[PDB]
Amino acid sequence: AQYDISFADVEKAHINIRDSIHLTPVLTSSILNQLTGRNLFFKCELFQKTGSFKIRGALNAVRSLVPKAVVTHSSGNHGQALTYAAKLEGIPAYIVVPQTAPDCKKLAIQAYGASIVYCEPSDESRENVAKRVTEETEGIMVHPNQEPAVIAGQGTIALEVLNQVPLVDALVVPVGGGGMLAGIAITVKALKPSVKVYAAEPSNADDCYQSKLKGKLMPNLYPPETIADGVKSSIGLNTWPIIRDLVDDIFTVTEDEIKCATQLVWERMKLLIEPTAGVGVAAVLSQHFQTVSPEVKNICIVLSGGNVDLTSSITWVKQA
Amino acid sequence: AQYDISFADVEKAHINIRDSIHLTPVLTSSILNQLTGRNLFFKCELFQKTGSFKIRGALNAVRSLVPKAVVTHSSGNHGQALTYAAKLEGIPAYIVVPQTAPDCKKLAIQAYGASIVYCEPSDESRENVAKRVTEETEGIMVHPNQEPAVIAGQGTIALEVLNQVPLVDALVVPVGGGGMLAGIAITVKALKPSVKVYAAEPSNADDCYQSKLKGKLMPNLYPPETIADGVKSSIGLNTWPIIRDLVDDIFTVTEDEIKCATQLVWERMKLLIEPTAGVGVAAVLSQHFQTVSPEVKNICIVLSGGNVDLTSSITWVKQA
Numbered sequence: 241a242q243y244d245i246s247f248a249d250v251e252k253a254h255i256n257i258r259d260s261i262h263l264t265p266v267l268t269s270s271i272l273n274q275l276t277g278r279n280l281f282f283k284c285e286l287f288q289k290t291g292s293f294k295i296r297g298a299l300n301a302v303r304s305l306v307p308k309a310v311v312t313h314s315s316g317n318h319g320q321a322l323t324y325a326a327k328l329e330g331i332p333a334y335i336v337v338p339q340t341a342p343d344c345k346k347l348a349i350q351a352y353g354a355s356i357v358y359c360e361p362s363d364e365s366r367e368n369v370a371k372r373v374t375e376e377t378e379g380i381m382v383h384p385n386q387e388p389a390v391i392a393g394q395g396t397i398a399l400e401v402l403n404q405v406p407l408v409d410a411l412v413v414p415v416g417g418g419g420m421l422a423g424i425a426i427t428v429k430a431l432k433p434s435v436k437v438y439a440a441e442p443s444n445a446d447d448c449y450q451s452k453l454k455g456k457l458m459p460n461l462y463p464p465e466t467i468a469d470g471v472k473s474s475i476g477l478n479t480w481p482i483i484r485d486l487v488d489d490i491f492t493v494t495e496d497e498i499k500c501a502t503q504l505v506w507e508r509m510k511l512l513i514e515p516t517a518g519v520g521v522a523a524v525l526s527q528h529f530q531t532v533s534p535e536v537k538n539i540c541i542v543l544s545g546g547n548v549d550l551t552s553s554i555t556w557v558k559q560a
Numbered sequence: 561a562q563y564d565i566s567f568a569d570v571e572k573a574h575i576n577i578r579d580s581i582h583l584t585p586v587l588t589s590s591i592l593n594q595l596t597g598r599n600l601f602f603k604c605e606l607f608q609k610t611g612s613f614k615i616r617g618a619l620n621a622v623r624s625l626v627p628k629a630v631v632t633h634s635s636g637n638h639g640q641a642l643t644y645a646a647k648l649e650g651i652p653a654y655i656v657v658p659q660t661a662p663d664c665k666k667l668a669i670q671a672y673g674a675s676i677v678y679c680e681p682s683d684e685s686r687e688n689v690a691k692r693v694t695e696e697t698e699g700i701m702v703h704p705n706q707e708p709a710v711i712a713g714q715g716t717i718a719l720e721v722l723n724q725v726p727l728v729d730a731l732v733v734p735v736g737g738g739g740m741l742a743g744i745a746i747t748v749k750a751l752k753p754s755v756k757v758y759a760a761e762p763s764n765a766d767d768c769y770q771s772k773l774k775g776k777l778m779p780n781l782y783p784p785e786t787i788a789d790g791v792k793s794s795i796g797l798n799t800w801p802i803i804r805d806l807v808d809d810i811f812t813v814t815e816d817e818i819k820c821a822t823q824l825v826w827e828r829m830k831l832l833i834e835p836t837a838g839v840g841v842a843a844v845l846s847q848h849f850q851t852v853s854p855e856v857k858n859i860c861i862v863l864s865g866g867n868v869d870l871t872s873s874i875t876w877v878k879q880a
């Protein structure tokens with residue numbers, strides 16, 4: 241009944257950020273339609289300010305939380321977005337980043353003027369270090385996915401999608417911490433609950449899937465190994481209840497599927513998505529998705545970001 | 561006064577192809593605006609059917625030229641577009657392609673069902689082989705840039721741009737054979753001749769520049785070596801007069817500039833342009849472009865194609 245955000249929070253966030261973000265386009269692909277048998281729509285958040293949708297939750301959080309500094313932990317995208325948002329107000333940013341995050345993300349964070357602080361690649365390390373930095377700097381913590389203002393910001397994506405694709409039957413959303421999935425679920429289920437909300441998740445980081453299956457929050461026991469570098473976080477205490485109750489299903493995809501789907505988008509849509517964003521595309525291409533009812537025809541997939549290391553990616557790109 | 565096409569040809573082409581092509585979007589970048597001091601608009605032909613604008617001239621040509629087969633020579637983009645267009649009518653295609661064309665383009669041509677015929681990398685070889693194949697197959701030749709129906713098809717880009725960017729002050733167009741540049745020049749100068757039409761050309765393939773300078777057609781003496789694989793052709797007899805009289809200026813760009821600009825678009829706009837399409841971006845970023853009057857503020861650059869070999873490109877991508 242009551243979750244940590246409401247639809248009204250999202251509507252408000254939208255008004256309050258819309259003049260500072262892009263109303264990103266929805267693009268289509270006949271090749272992907274052919275491959276899936278569905279009518280796909282791609283919400284291009286890769287074109288958002290800073291390279292990902294995270295500017296939404298960051299701007300909303302900065303504006304709303306009334307400071308000496310802002311602090312967060314991030315695999316890169318929330319960090320750069322938060323940095324940018326804070327810089328606009330003249331507030332310094334400290335960003336805790338796992339040592340194994342992509343270089344491109346590490347560099348962008350520094351380019352926006354943040355103090356970057358490397359941690360170990362685990363949820364525990366991210367959280368503990370950010371807590372310590374918060375204390376040391378007397379800054380304000382802006383969590384990448386569990387903070388209500390952030391979740392409400394991410395949910396604004398759905399307000400746009402429902403307007404841009406009026407006949408939409410489902411949204412497909414990549415899931416890490418569940419900030420975006422939760423905000424979108426709140427939004428869709430408030431406006432038009434007949435529209436499906438589906439999560440897409442790496443098999444190699446499948447806490448959300450396992451949580452849903454078990455009926456309780458089950459965080460990743462070991463730090464995930466995945467090319468989907470932006471969804472290694474486990475779901476949290478604020479997003480789980482929303483996901484439990486409002487998300488229709490969760491589809492897992494293997495590393496191979498993620499790589500194949502990412503490459504397909506690059507080659508056929510000419511959109512430089514990051515592999516994390518290739519998760520949702522893989523989901524719709526997957527065998528299990530074939531079990532979704534044929535009535536679920538018009539599907540919008542969120543292409544969540546385009547912050548990818550071009551040279552790293554050559555490692556996995558598949559020759560014909 | 562009279563050239564091989566007229567504005568009316570372009571208007572007609574537009575009506576006749578518009579239901580079979582995409583009305584591609586115009587995107588913007590604040591980073592590129594900052595770098596240039598101008599207000600840039602990017603016409604995303606990389607999102608066109610087949611990966612480039614060439615579907616325009618191909619569809620127009622196929623529909624218009626009333627056949628046993630169609631024949632052409634191409635570095636890849638016109639070939640795949642022509643193949644697709646012909647396949648829609650059930651007509652076989654023979655495509656003459658230089659041995660050194662990108663694999664991705666060679667493969668796509670074959671995927672669309674063409675018979676591919678490799679030639680040497682020269683204008684002379686392309687032309688001579690296509691003539692022979694034309695004779696042998698009793699097919700119809702559809703030249704990639706000198707055929708009036710093709711030129712008129714490419715010019716339709718300008719009809720869209722002038723509508724999408726009503727305040728436009730200049731178009732910047734990459735030039736190879738001059739099919740697109742010529743069609744666009746005819747169009748712009750007929751509708752609103754105050755709008756500048758500028759060509760962008762590799763220094764390593766600078767026939768168009770040299771022709772303009774000398775006041776006569778001066779083809780490349782040696783086969784160009786350039787990463788801009790799609791603009792190695794020299795201008796021809798039908799496009800030159802149009803270029804001579806209607807194009808405002810021609811900007812040359814070095815290989816380094818082309819690589820830098822291409823990479824910038826990839827990283828900052830998330831648009832998987834091919835290097836040929838990076839030619840026009842390089843032009844606007846170039847030192848010489850700084851000499852263009854500050855009144856020329858709103859500039860639309862045509863991102864002409866996105867048919868690039870991902871793995872080849874790793875050779876030149878510059879680390880930070």
Ligand SMILES: [Mn+2]
Pocket residue numbers: 415416441442445446447448471472473474475
């Ligand atoms: Mn997960």
Ligand SMILES: [Mn+2]
Pocket residue numbers: 735736761762765766767768791792793794795
């Ligand atoms: Mn040239």
